[PDB]
Amino acid sequence: MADFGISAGQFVAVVWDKSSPVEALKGLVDKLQALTGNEGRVSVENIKQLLQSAHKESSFDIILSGLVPGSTTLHSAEILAEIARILRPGGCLFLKEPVETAVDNNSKVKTASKLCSALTLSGLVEVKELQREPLTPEEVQSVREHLGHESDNLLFVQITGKKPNFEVGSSR
């Protein structure tokens, strides 16, 4: 539960994709379904079908996006939008995406800066990295064949962001 600050009695939506095999996915959602789905609720959505993830406004206290080892995915304003949209005020959002330390912000792939800025600008705040993961030959090929990411200055990293709740007045 400390992994994503999950709790029982809240609504947490788990977002998976091709990079998220049922082996791990089912497991991540299972534990969260027993700890969160017990008192609260747990929904499942696909990164590719994120468009349908737009259930309602501020309903999920927490949102997960590809939280597996070696995961490979790149979220954008279009995706992040839906997340935050359904993300309750004051909730949390955890996602993992490859970052490049030798390319512009936008580029062909969301970089570290672009990611943090995109998330914070997607309606989230207090965004920051939680951990760092190395690049493997089986992953790089997946992201390159799934998106087109191909570089040597790349590196997988996990980032999170908290949703702004009406009880502060920071900015957005």
Q: Which residues neighbour 80 within 8 Å (Cβ) at sequence distance 6 or greater? A: 118, 119, 122, 123, 124
Determined by: NMR
Q: Which of 8, 51, 47, 49 is nearest to 25 (CA)?
A: 47
- Domain 1-172: CATH superfamily, name plus number: Vaccinia Virus protein VP39 (3.40.50.150)
Q: State the sign of the Cα–Cα–Cα–Cα dihedral 110, 49, 15, 120.
A: positive
* Share of the chain residues as helix, strand and coil, in percent rounded to the nearest 5: 30, 30, 40
In the chain, domain spans: 1-172
CA distance 1 to 8: 9
Measured between alpha carbons, how far is residue 90 from residues 49, 61, 96 in Å?
Answer: 25, 7, 20
CA 12 to chain centre: 12
Q: Which helix H or strand E contains 83, and what residues bound it?
A: helix 77-86
Integer-rounded Cα radius of gyration of the chain: 15
